[PDB]
């Protein structure tokens, strides 16, 4: 099949800046190329067809160009709401093929996370398990480190975390980390702490609680 090589794979752009994404076809595809935009939790939306035609409603900020094997999608005056995955397609040769996609993130000023820790509920404990949760709210950049400590012992291998998609309004991220222990293990220690390290924190922030109540 015809391969569409899209670059770059990831991009961080500040609001107001220009975005340039390219797709290279392994064989000549004329102008039979389309560009799509897929926002978080949404289905792909057609932006450009036949290489350079804007679909009705798409703003002039989005421009498709190129012919033959080299195609480009340009986004000027990037808006916070433009964050999303962009993909190209070639419909000249069968089977129809797509580029790997480009994830465009919004680059904004650094924002330190607001940290919160949650002890396991008595209800869960009665079931034999203890989940301890640490929330890192509205921060930027996405890079952040959460270190769980139990009576000063650094934990590893017993936690999992997930991050929300970048906020379309303030361009921040939020992260939740869960430390999971058996009820028996939970009742062998006193101090549970979540230590957070982030670019916006001159010194790491630690939230904690003593097992009780």
């Amino acid at each position: 099949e015809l391969v569409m090589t899209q670059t770059p794979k990831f991009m961080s752009t500040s609001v107001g800046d220009r975005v340039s994404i390219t797709c290279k076809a392994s064989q000549n595809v004329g102008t039979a190329v389309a560009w799509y935009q897929q926002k978080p939790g949404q289905s792909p939306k057609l932006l450009i067809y036949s290489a350079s035609n804007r679909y009705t409603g798409v703003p002039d900020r989005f421009t498709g160009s190129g012919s033959g094997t080299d195609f480009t999608l340009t986004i000027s005056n990037m808006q916070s709401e433009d964050l999303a995955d962009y993909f190209c397609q070639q419909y000249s040769s069968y089977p129809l093929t797509f580029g790997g996609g480009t994830k465009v993130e919004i680059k904004r000023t650094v924002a330190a996370p607001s940290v919160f820790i949650f002890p396991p509920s008595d209800e869960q404990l009665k079931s034999g398990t203890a989940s301890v949760v640490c929330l890192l709210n509205n921060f930027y950049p996405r890079e952040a480190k959460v270190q769980w400590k139990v009576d000063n012992a650094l934990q590893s291998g017993n936690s999992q975390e997930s991050v929300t998609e970048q906020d379309s309004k303030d361009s921040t991220y939020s992260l939740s980390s869960t430390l999971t222990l058996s009820k028996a293990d939970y009742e062998k220690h006193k101090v549970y702490a979540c230590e957070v390290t982030h670019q916006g924190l001159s010194s790491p922030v630690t939230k904690s609680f003593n097992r009780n109540e």
């Binding site: 289905s43 129809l96 093929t97 209800e123 929330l135 929300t164």
Partner: protein, 216 residues
């Protein structure tokens, strides 16, 4: 066997089959080619094939010729895609396209696994008790041990949206998922306003409304 309506999500056993449906707009056109596309987590989009509801004509991507079958019920103007001999490789989000819409159809998810459906247990993530601040506080709900995806969470039945963060589910080593949803609110409202997380795990027909408050 398993029928999957557009925008739905269904768990199917490996080796079995599933049939997705997609209704045509109903508008009159000579041709109405509807395309089917597959999307996986860390993979690029893949084109499966197309079908013309008007004529019944089809065209497939050679790669899916043996596993996908496109058909149409002309009377009800409905297009179907059957996926056979399912494997973990078939787990993905599928989209159908329409010529008179700039957006592809919703997103229909297939989960291929032999693991049994299991409803979640919901636990409270209560605001700092005894040591509560004065600025902003946080509370939430931990939806643990369920299968398959998805689980949805709303707060106050949709009335509360500001400050809500519902996280992507995490797959545990047990093979079950866990998901957390939190919301930040004024530390002063903790004494009056009610905060309820509405959890729904459609696969197991499990719905839970849990009021979350600082523990005494």
């Amino acid at each position: 066997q398993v029928q999957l309506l557009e925008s739905g999500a269904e768990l199917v056993k490996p080796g079995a089959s599933v049939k997705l449906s997609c209704k045509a707009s109903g508008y009159t056109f000579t041709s109405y080619w509807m395309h089917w596309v597959k999307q996986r987590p860390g993979r690029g989009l893949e084109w499966i094939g197309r079908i013309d509801p008007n004529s019944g004509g089809t065209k497939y991507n050679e790669k899916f010729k043996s596993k996908a079958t496109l058909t149409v019920d002309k009377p009800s103007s409905t297009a179907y895609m059957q996926l056979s001999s399912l494997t973990s490789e078939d787990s993905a989000v599928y989209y159908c396209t329409r010529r008179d819409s700039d957006y592809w159809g919703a997103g229909t998810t297939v989960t291929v696994s032999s693991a049994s459906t299991k409803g979640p247990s919901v636990f409270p993530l209560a605001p700092s008790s005894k040591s509560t601040s004065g600025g902003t506080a946080a509370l939430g709900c931990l939806v643990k041990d369920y299968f398959p995806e998805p689980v949805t969470v709303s707060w106050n039945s949709g009335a509360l949206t500001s400050g809500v963060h519902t996280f992507p589910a995490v797959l545990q080593s047990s093979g079950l998922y866990s998901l957390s949803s939190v919301v930040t609110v004024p530390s002063s409202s903790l004494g009056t306003q009610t905060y309820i997380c509405n959890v729904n795990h459609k696969p197991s027909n499990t719905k839970v409304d849990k009021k979350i408050v600082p523990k005494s």
